[PDB]
Design a protein around this motif. Structure first.
Motif, PDB file in Angstrom:
ATOM      1  N   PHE A  23       0.870  -1.101   0.044  1.00 40.15           N
ATOM      2  CA  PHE A  23       0.166   0.079  -0.026  1.00 40.15           C
ATOM      3  C   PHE A  23       1.063   1.267   0.024  1.00 40.15           C
ATOM      4  O   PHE A  23       0.820   1.983  -0.864  1.00 40.15           O
ATOM      5  CB  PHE A  23      -0.813  -0.055   1.190  1.00 40.15           C
ATOM      6  N   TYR A  24       1.775   1.392   1.186  1.00 39.36           N
ATOM      7  CA  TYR A  24       2.545   2.740   1.080  1.00 39.36           C
ATOM      8  C   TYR A  24       3.714   2.786   0.267  1.00 39.36           C
ATOM      9  O   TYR A  24       3.784   3.799  -0.281  1.00 39.36           O
ATOM     10  CB  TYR A  24       2.872   2.525   2.625  1.00 39.36           C
ATOM     11  N   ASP A  26       3.381   1.913  -2.856  1.00 45.15           N
ATOM     12  CA  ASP A  26       2.510   2.362  -3.993  1.00 45.15           C
ATOM     13  C   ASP A  26       2.369   3.734  -3.770  1.00 45.15           C
ATOM     14  O   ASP A  26       2.730   4.716  -4.612  1.00 45.15           O
ATOM     15  CB  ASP A  26       1.461   1.420  -3.832  1.00 45.15           C
ATOM     16  N   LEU A  27       1.827   4.157  -2.435  1.00 50.56           N
ATOM     17  CA  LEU A  27       1.650   5.489  -2.074  1.00 50.56           C
ATOM     18  C   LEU A  27       2.298   6.758  -2.335  1.00 50.56           C
ATOM     19  O   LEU A  27       2.240   7.670  -2.867  1.00 50.56           O
ATOM     20  CB  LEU A  27       0.864   5.775  -0.644  1.00 50.56           C
TER      21      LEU A  27
END
Length: 155
Positions: A23-24, A26-27
DNA sequence: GGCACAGGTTCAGAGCAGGCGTTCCGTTC
DNA sequence: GAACGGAACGCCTGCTCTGAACCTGTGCC
């Protein structure tokens, strides 16, 4: 705006304390691409300032007012992020300046639009999405930083 | 020549204090 | 020794304290 603010804060805190998982990672690139796209979106991808005139009467000028506030909030958060990322690398600071230049452009557009009507539009002073913390750290780094390694960016 | 902020003003409400209304004792002829 | 003036406890009037908003006047863009 507030959403992005939440994201930024949680994510920075994550990187800070949690690690010492996709997730992070990616972010990072998410916000990067968003920032770059934000630099070179010039208010006619948003359909602002000339296509609309922020008429508080018209549904469309109302919408414009609202969209613009959102935009400025977004920009503010991205300012916080770009500052936070680097060890004072200069391209991101140029990006921050350009973001701010669009932000201020929007604020003075509203001054043109808030110069005409009576001064009961006290919604312009809608509170910033910058933490007290970041602001402390920013002025600390503006006025009491003589460190040459950083100073080229701060100049 | 116009807009924004200030400052005055005014009204609405609410709260409280004192003076008169009832009732009795002192003072002056 | 008596009467008329001084004196005390409660309720109503009104006046004041305060805030809030409108509006209008002046100075700067």
């Amino acid at each position: 705006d507030y959403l992005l603010c939440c994201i930024q804060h949680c994510l920075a805190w994550y990187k800070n304390t949690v690690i010492p998982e996709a997730f992070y990672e990616d972010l990072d690139d998410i916000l990067e691409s968003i920032t770059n796209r934000m630099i070179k979106s010039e208010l006619e991808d948003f359909e602002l300032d000339k296509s609309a005139d922020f008429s508080q009467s018209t549904s469309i000028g109302i919408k414009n007012n609202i969209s613009a506030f959102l935009v400025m909030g977004v920009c503010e958060v991205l300012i916080e992020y770009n500052f936070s990322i680097s060890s004072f690398s200069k391209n991101r600071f140029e990006d921050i300046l350009s973001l701010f230049m669009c932000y201020k452009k929007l604020s003075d557009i509203l001054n043109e639009k808030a110069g005409k009507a009576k001064t009961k539009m006290a919604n312009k002073t809608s509170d910033s999405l910058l933490s007290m913390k970041f602001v402390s750290s920013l002025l600390t780094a503006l006025f009491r930083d003589s460190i040459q390694s950083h100073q080229e960016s701060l100049s």
